[PDB]
Amino acid sequence: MKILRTPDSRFANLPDYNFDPHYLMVDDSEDSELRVHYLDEGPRDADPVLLLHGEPSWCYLYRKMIPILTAAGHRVIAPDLPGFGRSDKPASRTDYTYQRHVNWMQSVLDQLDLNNITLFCQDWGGLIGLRLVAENPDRFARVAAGNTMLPTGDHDLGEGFRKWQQFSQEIPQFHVGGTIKSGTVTKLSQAVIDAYNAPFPDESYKEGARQFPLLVPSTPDDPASENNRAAWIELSKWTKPFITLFSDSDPVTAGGDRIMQKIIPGTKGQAHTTIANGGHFLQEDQGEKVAKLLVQFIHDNPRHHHHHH
């Protein structure tokens, strides 16, 4: 595979974003490697909070959440998926697969040796992140999920998702900022919208953004269907804390918290809530509120341990 790298001038002086870049290389699965950007904030020895973004966002989506988390003493890891943000971007839509995305984020976990993780996931950050939880029980301490899902393809995904999937593929050019506007309930400033467009100087950089909706399992024969069935059987044994923080104004994922509460034992006892005045990209509309709830969630669910452990 071939990769594109967004010029660094694109990332200059973005609103409410001043986080230094970190990088690591991951195997591209085709005999080379590509660069993953991530943020790594907060005390070096603190348990990490892993913030995974999805389609078609990047770690900028988390910028209002990160300072609240680090002020409360948390280490925060916020990676950019290949195809997005400051990460390298495979040049063909066919380069992007569900399994590759899982493997690329697994490599982040492995290289950073993240343990005792609190995951917060949304959109594809949950399609990927919940797979990582299922496949790495011993690395995760807690999970928070908002406006996400984990489809196996055995069921209809519903009105909202079907509309999105169709629109995302029909449009002549993919307007990343347009998608963020459509998935928020706030009149975003143009400089914020421009920050969502920053990774993508032209259409050639958008192949990951264009492929993502096609990778969502919607049939039982999807290449990810069985892996997601297996993930659900692991989640049905997840007894550690699991909270849902879905918002009120996202038809694509509405009600998706109920199946998590039904199936996942570690949801029992947690103070799930519905984030008011929040669209699909609830971190953009309601980042402060969500981050405060995530701080509280960690506080309400201590991990008892010795020093250095």
Ligand SMILES: [Cl-]
């Ligand atoms: Cl736009």
Ligand SMILES: [Cl-]
């Ligand atoms: Cl999608």
Ligand code: NA
């Ligand atoms: Na429950």
